[PDB]
Amino acid sequence: TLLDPLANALSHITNSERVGKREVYIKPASKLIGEVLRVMQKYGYIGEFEFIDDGRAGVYRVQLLGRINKAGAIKPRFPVKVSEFEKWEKRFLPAFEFGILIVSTSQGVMSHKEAIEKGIGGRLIAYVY
């Protein structure tokens, strides 16, 4: 069986981008992927995406702008204090500018910069840049 469905989906979505493919089809599909995709889209990394809800499985078909440099998930999904954010911010993110080290917070799901603006935080879900 799979686990971390987001990791797999991200791993595909990045490998997709690396190729320069027109669109992506991610077969195993979720809230984790879809909420992350909606936060990704909201920043502008991806274009439009449609999910047909098949009686078997959602499929997401994601448009690739070409803006994503890398998007993958975080192996343990560690807990990280808002004071620890800055440690993580240098490690993972390529610069101060990019600021999607997606964290899931009390507020709902936010990017890294959006997580900051409210101020709040939680367990590390993934990154986008």
Place this chain on the structure above:
Amino acid sequence: MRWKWIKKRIRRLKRQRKKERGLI
């Protein structure tokens, strides 16, 4: 090579274990 060694180790083990056995 590797045969050399196995028989040396076995001769060492068996003569020495003979000296253990006949020290036994």
Place this chain on the structure above:
Amino acid sequence: MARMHARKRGKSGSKRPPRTAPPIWVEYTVEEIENLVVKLRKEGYSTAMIGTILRDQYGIPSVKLFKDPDNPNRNLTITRILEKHGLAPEIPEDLMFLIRRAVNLRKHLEQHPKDLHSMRGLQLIESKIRRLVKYYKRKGKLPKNWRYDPETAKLLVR
């Protein structure tokens, strides 16, 4: 899609319909579909085969879709229909069929024992039963005062 378990060969590419409500080009009433299920169960056909007959003959691919809504706590699909009438086996059709077959091998080993392959198969079948049984205990299709062993298996079959 596939998974290699006691083989390196992929699993069948077959799929369900992606249908989510049913043909109205196929037509049966709730009263009529319960009757079809019950009749086939009476024969001694099992619930897998019962649906097989209903898809080929009566043109109904999966029960769930056709029936419910008619009582929308959950789907009305073959062993549920049967559970309400009291026609269900208490043991689940998954667990029953695995066990039965396991008793049949044993008999071959008895007259014949010099089998590498058949012997090994007995290991394989039993291990699946441990997993299938361990989860069922928790959910309540099997009490927790049970445990799996091969005389206890011959006692269920017989």
Place this chain on the structure above:
Amino acid sequence: GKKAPNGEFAGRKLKLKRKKFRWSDIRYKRRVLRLKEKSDPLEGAPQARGIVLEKIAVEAKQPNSGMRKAVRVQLIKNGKVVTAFCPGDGAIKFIDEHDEVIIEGIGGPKGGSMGDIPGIRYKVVKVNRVSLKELVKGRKEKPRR
């Protein structure tokens, strides 16, 4: 996975993994046990005095031939035989047999000698509690008994 568990609860597995995998270092395994302290005599000490049993010369290594000046000493408290290599040219002349001698390691305590010397683990600093490097130069101090 590349190898090691990663799970929030899993941490003990990693904690044990490193300690076990750490011992694969000889030097780490050695100091922690105290195989360094115990084995190469001294009792871990920086130096030791001993009495000169005799002056012996040892031959040089695979390229080399030369009679290197050495003292066989007996360390006092320890009560062990050490072979200790005398520095400076003229040096062996100053060491009178049965004087008090102070002995140090040379070039890692690890057991390794200089390349040229075979068995010698050690250095001789002192004769009758004045160092050889002093005795090399005429003016400074000049020896006794």
Place this chain on the structure above:
RNA sequence: UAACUUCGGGAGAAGGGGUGCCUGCGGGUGCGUAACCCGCAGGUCGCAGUGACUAGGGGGGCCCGACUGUUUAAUAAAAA
């Protein structure tokens, strides 16, 4: 409670402690206070409580023969 080991044994190893009489209890089996047996506490005398009679000294190496048995009925019971 060791060496050894054919795991059966070695082993009752070895070594150390206790044990009497009285006074009072408890348990077991039973049936009702019989017939016995197994423990527990206190008090107390002697040099010594299995006081008598009955009653193994122990430990280790080696040689031979596996063992038990048999043997020169009556100078040799052993390794034969």
Place this chain on the structure above:
RNA sequence: GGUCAGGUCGAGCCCGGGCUCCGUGAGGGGGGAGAAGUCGUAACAAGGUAACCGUAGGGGAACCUACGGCUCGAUCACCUCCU
């Protein structure tokens, strides 16, 4: 405060055994050094019997041989590939 009974806290001393650590012995094995002798030519080229390997026996020794494996395998041929 005396002596004396019973009882209690209670070392060192002695004995026996258990666990652990150090020095050290007839005799007997290999190990890393040594410049130079001896015997043979083992591997490295198909090393002049391809090599290795697991196992088993033998030979002073490197080793040889059986069986089964493997090519990290040998020569053009071969076969087969590929072309």
Place this chain on the structure above:
RNA sequence: CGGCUUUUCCGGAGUGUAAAAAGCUCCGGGAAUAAGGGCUGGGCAAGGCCGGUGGCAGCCGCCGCGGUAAUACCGGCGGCCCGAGUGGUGGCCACUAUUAUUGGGCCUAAAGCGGCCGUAGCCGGGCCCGUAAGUCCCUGGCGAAAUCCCACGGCUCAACCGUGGGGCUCGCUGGGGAUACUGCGGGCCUUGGGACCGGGAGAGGCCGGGGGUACCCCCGGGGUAGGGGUGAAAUCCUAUAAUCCCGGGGGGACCGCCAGUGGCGAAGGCGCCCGGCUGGAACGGGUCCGACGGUGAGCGCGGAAGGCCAGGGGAGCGAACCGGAUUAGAUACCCGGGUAGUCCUGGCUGUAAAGGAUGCGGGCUAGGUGUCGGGCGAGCUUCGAGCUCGCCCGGUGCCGUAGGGAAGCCGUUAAGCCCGCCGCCUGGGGAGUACGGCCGCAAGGCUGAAACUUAAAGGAAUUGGCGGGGGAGCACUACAAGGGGUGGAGCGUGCGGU
């Protein structure tokens, strides 16, 4: 050489002491007046000459230097560093993502368990709802001073000290809030998983039955003097006759061609044919359960050949062995005999270059070609998917894009890109040894060190040389073919030796 100032140092005044000293501080007197230690070859270069010495004596942290013109030694001279220090030996951290959490590997460099299962453990698809344990936010109780950092202030300066702010191993506590994520509880779904029906391929397994080839033997006939064996040979066999040839009968082991770049199996591994029993496996149709899932320490199980055990068998083969040859010798290649074993049954043993030196599962990432098995739409038909084109599903091979790789190679059958989980590695030899323990009948297996010693061990690829390695091609210092000659003699001549 001219001028200037003038640290220690003297003398004095208070101080301080609540006795000195510490002699400061103030003032008078007053001198250019304490500087050393390492290195100088590559490494570090940061720094070069002469003399002496001559693979010595020494130098030494490593690589190294000294074997008669040494920049490396010794001394001098000169230069570089650093400076009241400088340098040696030892220990610790760094460098060492050589312990990998940040941040490491495992095809061939060290390293994949010979394969599996499933337990502990880790990890887990979607949708809804409750709680809010993890998690995040806020408040608050609190984690001494000191050390550390920042500010200001104090001591001539600064070290240090005062004050003010921050942080601290920061492991504990209470209340309020958020609910994405995670944990728990409940409900809900079919993509994963398991399950069903029906076609179907195959050297999977077990059992029964059953044929023939060849080898061997035995028997009769026929038929003479050799057969066999090799590079040559010998041993050997054979004269109550072998080899051969013909017929007859017995025995044990196996099943060329078929047979494929082929099929099957978890792995070890698996080939006459036939039937029965029986394992796995593909596809179409998801027809049935409804996350039941993945991995898996421990544990359990199968595991060639060889060995062991009991019992039964034995043609051919053949360790050991016995001859013969070969060879300098041959404990060998080569030949001629031969026992264990090779066969069966039962048990044991438990290894391997047990290989694809590549643990398992899922997702994503150019393709091309051949091939096996399954589905489909046609043409062909001997009307059977028999021949064939393509799409697709499962499987096995080659080639190759992007990428990875040190390269060789790998490249949808990953060594790519990810995630989850296991085993294992961390320089070499010592040593896969010693002990100890466990297992085994035994042989042996499993586990598994240290003393000591080394600047390599090692992998790929390059260039050349080399090969009783291959292919092509010439030669006359080549070989053959061929003619003449040296080696024999006497002498001339050069040499060895004397």
Place this chain on the structure above:
RNA sequence: GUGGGGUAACGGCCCACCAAGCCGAAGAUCGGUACGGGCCGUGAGAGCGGGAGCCCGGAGAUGGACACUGAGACACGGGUCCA
């Protein structure tokens, strides 16, 4: 577990009776090594290593055992006693 003593005081601390538990692979037990903490050393960090003056707490006073006197001691420069 029940009841009881003893202590300043809970409590298998001690004791009588009763029960058969308790502890362990999320590594007990045993062996080794060690005062612990604030801190410290190094290191970009993470991390590693360390317990030194000082401060904070305990432990000890030739080795072992023991009371008295006092709020407090089983008492470094008080006593008894064995070695």
